[PDB]
Amino acid sequence: MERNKLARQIIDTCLEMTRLGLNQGTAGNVSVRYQDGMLITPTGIPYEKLTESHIVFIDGNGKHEEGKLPSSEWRFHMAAYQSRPDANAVVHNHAVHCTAVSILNRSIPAIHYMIAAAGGNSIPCAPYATFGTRELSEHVALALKNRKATLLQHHGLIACEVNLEKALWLAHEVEVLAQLYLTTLAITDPVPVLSDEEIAVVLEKF
Amino acid sequence: MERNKLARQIIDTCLEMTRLGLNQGTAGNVSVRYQDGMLITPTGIPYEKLTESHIVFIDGNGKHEEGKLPSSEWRFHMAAYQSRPDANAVVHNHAVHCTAVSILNRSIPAIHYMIAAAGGNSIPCAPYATFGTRELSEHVALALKNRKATLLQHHGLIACEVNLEKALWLAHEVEVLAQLYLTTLAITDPVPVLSDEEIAVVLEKF
Amino acid sequence: MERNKLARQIIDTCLEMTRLGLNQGTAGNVSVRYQDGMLITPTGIPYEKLTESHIVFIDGNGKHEEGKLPSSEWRFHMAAYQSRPDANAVVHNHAVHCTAVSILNRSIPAIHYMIAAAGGNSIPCAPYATFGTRELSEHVALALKNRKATLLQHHGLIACEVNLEKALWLAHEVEVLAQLYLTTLAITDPVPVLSDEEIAVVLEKF
Amino acid sequence: MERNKLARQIIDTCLEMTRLGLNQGTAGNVSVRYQDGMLITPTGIPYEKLTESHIVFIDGNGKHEEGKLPSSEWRFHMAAYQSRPDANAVVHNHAVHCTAVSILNRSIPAIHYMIAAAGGNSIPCAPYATFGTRELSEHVALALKNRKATLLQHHGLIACEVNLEKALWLAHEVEVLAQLYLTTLAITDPVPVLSDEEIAVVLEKF
Ligand SMILES: [Zn+2]
Ligand SMILES: [Zn+2]
Ligand SMILES: [Zn+2]
Ligand SMILES: [Zn+2]
């Protein structure tokens, strides 16, 4: 639980995220809770040139280390740490099926029982607001109140969890749910869903 | 035919299954017939951390080794060993095209002559029932009576065979059949199919 | 131009074909012209266990080496060598977009100027006939008369060329044309095409 | 900034472009500004056999080095260097989602805020004209006047930038935008877009 073990996993998550096809168009941002703020990936540097010493600490006041530019999307990683106190790692990306679904501006309903992993009977879509703005943050903060993952209209996904390992696993899971919904949406609308009861038992079980 | 040669192939099948894009969202479960029960992958451990000594033996009575948690989906691997006496390895996964087809709750008809590999003129979809429950098992058991692979509504696929090598090969084959049906379903419905006669000769031939 | 240089490239083509996503569900068959017959991949053996000494010579009379089983699909590799005298290597596969298009039983029209690589303004679909039968051969033989690649109804693709390098390149090219046609077919039908004149100049040019 | 550092990156871009799934059917062409002309990939040679000494210098007069054939598509890399004076590297490819969109002959509108990377509220499609012709060049030259990437009807994509690193990054970005538009187009038409105002702020911001 040293700074650099934390900055290495963040890097490992980038590379691994890219491995899975989650980060295409080198746009993801990864962060973890630390001290009174967080560590996040820097802006600019492509993921393959990232060393532990690129990772930027941002304190709880919004000030970032000297001579380092945090991701341009950092403000909403801060929103999720204050909206979800149990959240300890945060993953963001423009994964394609997620984003297609966010362009349609729809929530993904309970088409498959793994929707439960994000906490309920859906994956919501928060409305559009320019990137890096405080209003973008307000949407995300209210979206993540009862869910661990959220789509972002005309933009992409955010997934939060107790460590990067599970944060990643959820992000990825939601990408699969996303693809499944688009692929069936092209055949029939609406798509058959599982009742709220049924999701209730899966959540009890989970 | 030692315990560990069996637990290694199970692992090799996981990794290889993941290689092909069959296991996405680390959800597959693999098992083989053994003694009076089976060996299966454990629950929790991601596939890349699996050693031979993680694999859990479950006896024919339903009791699993001490201090090891079998997959949460083990009950229906047991159903397939008792429904199909010739089945010696079992593969399960939430492969995406299979699952999309299982969300539509349709059977995949004879759109291509390789449907014969699973034993007949289709790949059925058994109805939904909560995971890990005995009622889930009853559906799978009656589904696999005349077929070696079956979809599972709002859930995924199960494929059984004489060893893991062919169990895997079928699983994979069905994923391709799945994709083919969705891709053509988006253009025209119904999708052109091959007569029952025609499937009869392919089965004779096969 | 020894037997084994020829059997190695056949293997290299299998592995490479699998690399590109052309051979999924280990179904492709590869062959090259040799002496008075050809060399072809054997039936059964998965591609990763193939050594040069697995490759089976089939003479012009239809008799195959002693103690070796040629692909089950060999008869139509022989049809293409007698239908196209300039053909020296032959590639076959159940590539998914090609096959989806062959399930719709449509020819792929001049949607993109690379259709010219196969010799004209389309990639035809020959009608269905059971695999391995002489009637399957008659369809393929008349299909390849004026084209170097052909789809096969409810089955897959065949592509022929002066060596394996170009045979492969065409096979692959046709897979891309296939995907392009399906992807646009789901939006609008018919798909915009390039006039016959226009294809004429591309062929002059090519 | 030697000739060979420039010819190596061109090669690295080919291989890397192929890595991402941008160059399928070995059709891409890459070039960089040099002296009074450019360096470009040669025609024929597959990308895996390219050494630095294959790369052909073409002067500003249209004459190419002795005993070397430039890409057949070189004329329009020259058009982009004279249409966009700030352009220093050029990437071209028949990437599949881009091309499907170019077969529909539509421009990709502001479905996602990254459309701004190419300079405005869209990615245009220039009309069809035979490859390698001066009229093909006139279309591309007027297309790239206010945009850094353009689709080409029934053909593919062109993306230009200050070096190969960003030229590639844009090409790739546009492929993702392309896929997103097709995937949502199959569900609903028109696809929801972001106002011109909204794109204006993203461009200010960017
Ligand atoms: Zn973003
Ligand atoms: Zn399952
Ligand atoms: Zn075949
Ligand atoms: Zn081109």
Report the count of strand segments of chain A.
Answer: 9
User: From the structure provided, what is the oligomeric state, counting identical versus distinct chains?
Assistant: homotetramer
CATH homologous superfamily caption of chain A: Class II aldolase/adducin N-terminal domain
Strand-residue proportion of chain A: 15-25%
CATH class of chain A: Alpha Beta
Number of helices of chain A: 6
Distance between the termini of chain A: 29 Å
Could you say which overall geometry of chain A the principal axes of the C-alpha atoms support?
Answer: globular
Query: Approximately how much helix is present in the residues of chain A?
Result: 25-40%
Number of domains of chain A: 1
The molecules bound to the chains, other than polymers, are: zinc ion
CATH-assigned fold name of chain A: L-fuculose-1-phosphate Aldolase
The topology string of helices and strands of chain A comes to HEEEHEHEEEHEEHH
Order of strands, widest sheet of chain A: 3-2-1-4-9-8-7
What does the main sheet of chain A amount to? 7 strands, mixed
> Which CATH-level-2 architecture of chain A?
3-Layer(aba) Sandwich
Enzyme class (chains A, B, C, D): lyase
Site (Plays a key role in the stabilization of the transition state and positioning the aldehyde component) (chains A, B, C, D): 113, 131
GO molecular function, one term (chains A, B, C, D): L-fuculose-phosphate aldolase activity
Pathway (chains A, B, C, D): Carbohydrate degradation; L-fucose degradation; L-lactaldehyde and glycerone phosphate from L-fucose: step 3/3
